[PDB]
From a paper:
The plasma membrane Ca2+ ATPase (PMCA) plays an essential role to regulate cellular Ca2+ homeostasis in all eukaryotic cells. PMCA extrudes excess Ca2+ from the cytoplasm, a process that maintains a steep gradient between intracellular (~100 nM) and extracellular Ca2+ (~2 mM). PMCA belongs to the family of P-type ATPases. Recently, two immunoglobulin (Ig) superfamily proteins, neuroplastin (NPTN) and basigin (BASI), were identified as previously unrecognized obligatory subunits of PMCAs and essential for the efficient control of the PMCA-mediated Ca2+ clearance.
Residue numbers in the entry:
A (entry chain A): 2 to 37, 67 to 129, 150 to 290, 360 to 500, 507 to 568, 573 to 590, 596 to 654, 673 to 1063
B (entry chain B): 120 to 246
Write the structure that this text describes.
């Protein structure tokens, strides 16, 4: 409890830029030492908890999410349910009294409505639990660069405190506000706070203040934390679709249709009763014994409401949200992390993937395959060669080969730094020489990549050297080491006889040539031979994607033949016909009249031809993707999935319909603007994302044919049975049980499906193609016909068939039934064996095969089977069944397997 | 007054060897005499005790017919009781049916046959 917190919430962070004239008598490291500078961390993992307790904790929570009691309250306000409760109370009300066991039919409605609303609430609660399970792990991974011991390591963003040091650069965020100390250029964004979406300098003269929720655009530097949590400024101010349109339209049409069909059954029932009693079969009996007649009106009205329960699916778009939730939690294991809940379904309808090359297709573990030291193209792998070791070993100060990973079995090491350099040093360690012996030698001026022509050079002992490209540096070169050796002064003899006749016949002709040049007009030490390996899965993956309609279009900043090499080696440019690449400049030349970028010509041309867009800019990728998603030729076009992880990848990645962002070496501005983070950069993970996007849109209709079948069969049974005899055969509790088997439990059952590889054999859908296809409708009407035939055979003639006496028709009081139990059991077990047969759209026939990837389906179907085994023998007079016995079970299970066979017969007779 | 039967079975399903318990409960005064009949070809017939399986216990206002050792060929049909006093008579109908002679076995074979059909179809298509 002793620090410099004299302003306890605005400690120095009030406003720019008249604050740097007086910052607690204007001394930045003095305020640091009064608050703690470079370079120390802590020793005590409780001292961090002291400054947690004293200003403060970083993690800012939302009011989350809702109590379970809140959702039980929420789902008991549907007007259908409250009308059902009211009529249940009235139904038992005209039992007490009338001029026995006429008591349970209302109590069963009341208690069962309590149970069905409890099950729907428990559903919705678990749904929010899986979205929290997503949200926790996406709250991780955002690490920073804290100066701890000089062995600087990445800690999570929540466990940061005040008094520590952050070492920031271009690409990442500001997690906690503060004070500059050291360097640099350091332009930042301020688009989250101020409307000036521009670039602002930061230095120790103007603005030593950094703001959380912004992100650095270029430069580097080093800061000291001021504030965290809600004590931070953004926290204080924070204190003070695509598919579902079709489902809402379809559900409103079903709502109107069922809302009229229930009223038809009600009107027919009251008319049929009053006519068949009092105006005909009459003898009018209008007398003082009224409430039995009002009691029959109550029973008719309960049939109407219990048909409206079935005929309106209570949550239909919640199919999308359930399936997408369970899909998110199982995607997270497949390297594929979803950040916005609309890029799951949208891709989806992918047509093009404007990918990048470096790291996304290749393995990004490159080697040094060839070389030119002994004058020529000798294959895979002397005081001038000592000088060559001085070049290849004294390149930088952060070469960082940490070579003894990962289990010390197979010689597969990884590295740290820009990986061409580590490839260079790695196959200069394969020439059995000590680089670490000569790296001390101590480091004059070793230039960075920043130069006029952008090489990276070194001035050391007066032996000045420089890495950098052959078409960048070899122009400046003066002479060649002659076989150890001597000097041979340049000419266009070199530029055509070596640069063309020897350099251009490189491998295919990759890759990325540099020189490692002597300085003092230069001297050709050697050049290269560089190759990064394509992943072993990529040439299968691009073919598997290519068959699925998606046209991959590689875009990179690279030159020039290199992209052609990797294109033909991967299989994008099938070298039969077409098409052509670019140099980098010509896409800006094609076209501007007059400056330009005419969407007429750019939307026209050259459209299917850019499979390679080499030497790009982020502005060039933005021009391309902005050209693609437009009003164009084919009027289906298009939905694109761009990748990319540069700092300047803001607008392009933002405009496209589904983003992607690398997540090994990928800057944080790219992730905050993204839509899906990949975790191991594999292009096969984009293939798996396309697979899951197929899977959601198939799982919706795979739910929907089951739900639509149960709706049609229940409504026609209720209507026609209620038109011949004066009641529906399904009483008002077991109708709610069929609600609970078709609406919440069914969606949770068969909406969770692992995908296959059969979802990659069809042309991708267009976003106007209808929701109930033809085979869809065939399965619907076929199973509807079979169940109407079985239910009406067991409803009109099951009494002269095996046994026993006709339940139709019956008085009010009543004995339960015996015959209607066989109707109800054949109906429910026939829907349960349908619930396997609705697992195949788009052709048949492997059911059951293979329902063992699901745990949920295989527990819900057999659980509902066992629950109905209990409900039929037990609780008879409440749940309107009776003590059913074999053999009648075994005939009903025979007819259930009957629908399992007849639906398999519907796999034939196509159109 | 006239006899009036109150409680009885409209049906009875039993199986082989069990004991079919049929009863009628009458009210009225005096207590009526009980006659059990059997419906044959549109005419009421008496119960003949050549099977040795009929046991009638008649009290004042309660009766009970108990037919031991049921068989499928003879014992199912239609039965009735006759509660008769000096004022009149009364009658209700209690119907018996027996489920025996296999008894339930035919659709179990149906299940197994249909399993074999669908498994054969899945075998044929996947090769
Ligand atoms: C039928 O005969 C047996 C044999 O004695 C006897 O016990 C039984 O009471 C008789 N039943 C009737 C209805 O006569």
């Amino acid at each position: 409890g002793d620090m410099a917190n004299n302003s306890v919430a605005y400690s120095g962070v009030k406003n720019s830029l008249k604050e740097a004239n007086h910052d607690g008598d204007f001394g930045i490291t003095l305020a640091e030492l009064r608050a703690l500078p470079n370079e120390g961390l802590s020793g005590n993992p409780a001292d961090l908890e002291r400054r947690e307790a004293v200003f403060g904790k970083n993690f800012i929570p939302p009011k989350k999410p809702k109590t379970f009691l809140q959702l039980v309250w929420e789902a008991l306000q549907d007007v259908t349910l409250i009308i059902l409760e009211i009529a249940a109370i009235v139904s038992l009300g005209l039992s007490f009294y009338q001029p026995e066991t006429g008591w349970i039919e209302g109590a069963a409605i009341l208690l069962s409505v309590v149970c069905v609303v409890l099950v729907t609430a428990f559903n919705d609660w678990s749904k929010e639990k899986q979205f929290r399970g997503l949200q926790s792990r996406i709250e991780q991974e955002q690490k920073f660069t804290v100066i701890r011991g000089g062995q600087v390591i990445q800690i999570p963003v929540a466990d940061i405190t005040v008094g520590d040091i952050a070492q920031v650069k271009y690409g990442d965020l500001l997690p906690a506000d503060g004070i500059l100390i050291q360097g640099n250029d350091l332009k930042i964004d301020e688009s989250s706070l101020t409307g000036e979406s521009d670039h602002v300098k930061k230095s120790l003269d103007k603005d030593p203040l950094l703001l959380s929720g912004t992100h650095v655009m270029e430069g580097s530097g080093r800061m000291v934390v001021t504030a965290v949590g809600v004590n931070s400024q953004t926290g204080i101010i924070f204190t003070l679709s695509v598919l579902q349109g079709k489902l809402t339209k379809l559900a409103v049409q079903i709502g109107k249709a069922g809302l009229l069909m229930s009223a038809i059954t009600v009107i027919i029932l009251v008319l049929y009763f009053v006519i068949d009693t009092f105006w005909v079969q009459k003898r009018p009996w209008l007398a003082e014994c009224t409430p039995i007649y009002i009691q029959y009106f109550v029973k008719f009205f309960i049939i109407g409401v219990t048909v409206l329960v079935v005929a309106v699916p209570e949550g239909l778009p919640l199919a999308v949200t359930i399936s997408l939730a369970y899909s998110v939690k199982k995607m997270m294991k497949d390297n594929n992390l979803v950040r916005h809940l609309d890029a799951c379904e949208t891709m989806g309808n992918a047509t093009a993937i404007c990918s990048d090359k470096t790291g996304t297709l290749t393995m990004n573990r490159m080697t040094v395959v060839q070389a030119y030291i002994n004058e020529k193209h000798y294959k895979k792998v002397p005081p001038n060669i000592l000088s060559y070791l001085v070049t290849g070993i004294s390149v930088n100060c952060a070469y960082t080969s940490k070579i003894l990973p990962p289990e010390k079995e197979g010689g597969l090491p990884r590295h740290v730094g820009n990986k061409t350099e580590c490839a260079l040093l790695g196959l200069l360690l394969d020439l059995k020489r000590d680089y670490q012996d000569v790296r001390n030698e101590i480091p004059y001026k070793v230039y960075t990549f920043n130069s006029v022509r952008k090489s990276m050079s070194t001035v050391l002992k007066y032996r000045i050297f420089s890495k950098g490209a052959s078409e960048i540096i070899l122009k400046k070169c003066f002479k060649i080491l002659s076989a150890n050796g001597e000097a041979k002064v340049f000419r266009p003899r070199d530029r055509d006889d070596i640069v063309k006749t020897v350099i251009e016949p490189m491998a295919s002709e990759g890759l990325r040539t540099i020189c490692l040049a002597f300085r003092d007009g230069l001297t050709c030490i050697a050049v290269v031979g560089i190759e990064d390996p394509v992943r072993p899965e990529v040439p299968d993956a691009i073919k598997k994607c290519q068959r699925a309609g998606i046209t991959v279009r590689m875009v990179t900043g690279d030159n020039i033949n290199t992209a052609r090499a990797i294109a033909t080696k991967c299989g994008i440019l099938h070298p039969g016909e077409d098409f052509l690449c670019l140099e980098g400049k010509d896409f800006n030349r094609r076209i501007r009249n007059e400056k330009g970028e005419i969407e007429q010509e750019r939307i026209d041309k050259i459209w299917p031809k850019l499979r390679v867009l080499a030497r790009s800019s982020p502005t060039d990728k933005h021009t391309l993707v902005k050209g693609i998603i437009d009003s164009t030729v084919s009027d289906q076009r298009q939905v694109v999935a761009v990748t990319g992880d540069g700092t300047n990848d803001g607008p392009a990645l933002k405009k496209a319909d589904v983003g992607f962002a690398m997540g090994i070496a990928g800057t944080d501005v790219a992730k905050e603007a993204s839509d899906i983070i990949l975790t191991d950069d594999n292009f096969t993970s984009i293939v798996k994302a396309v697979m899951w996007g197929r899977n959601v849109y198939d799982s919706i209709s795979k739910f929907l044919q089951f739900q639509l079948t149960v709706n049609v069969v229940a409504v026609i049974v209720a209507f026609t049975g209620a038109c011949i005899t004066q009641d529906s055969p399904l009483k008002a509790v077991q109708m709610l049980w069929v609600n609970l088997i078709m609406d919440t439990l069914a969606s949770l059952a068969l909406a969770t499906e692992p995908p296959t590889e059969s979802l990659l054999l069809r042309k991708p859908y267009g976003r106007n193609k209808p929701l109930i296809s033809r085979t869809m409708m065939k399965n619907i009407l076929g199973h509807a016909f079979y169940q109407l035939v079985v239910v009406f055979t067991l409803l009109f003639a099951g009494e002269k068939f095996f046994d026993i006496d006709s339940g139709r028709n019956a008085p009010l009081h009543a004995p339960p039934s015996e015959h209607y139990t066989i109707v109800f059991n054949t109906f429910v077990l026939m829907q349960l064996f349908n619930e396997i047969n609705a697992r195949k759209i788009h052709g048949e026939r492997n059911v059951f095969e293979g329902i063992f990837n699901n745990a949920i389906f295989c527990t819900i179907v057999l659980g509902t089977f066992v629950v109905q085994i209990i409900i039929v023998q037990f609780g008879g007079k409440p749940f309107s069944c009776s003590e059913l016995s074999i053999e009648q079970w075994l005939w009903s299970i025979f007819l259930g397997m009957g629908t399992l066979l007849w639906g398999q017969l519907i796999s034939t007779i196509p159109t | 007054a006239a006899p009036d039967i109150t409680g009885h079975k409209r049906s009875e399903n039993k199986n082989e060897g069990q004991d079919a318990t049929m009863y009628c409960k009458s009210v009225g005064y005096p207590h009526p005499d009980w006659i059990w009949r059997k419906k044959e070809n549109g005419m009421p017939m008496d119960i003949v005790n050549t099977s040795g399986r009929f046991f009638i216990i008649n009290k004042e206002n309660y009766t009970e017919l108990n037919i031991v050792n049921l068989q499928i060929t003879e014992d199912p049909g239609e039965y009735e009781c006759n509660a008769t006093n000096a004022i009149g008579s009364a009658s209700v109908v209690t119907v018996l049916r027996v489920r025996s002679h296999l008894a339930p076995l035919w659709p179990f074979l149906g299940i197994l046959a249909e399993i074999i059909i669908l498994v054969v179809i899945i075998v044929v298509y996947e090769k």
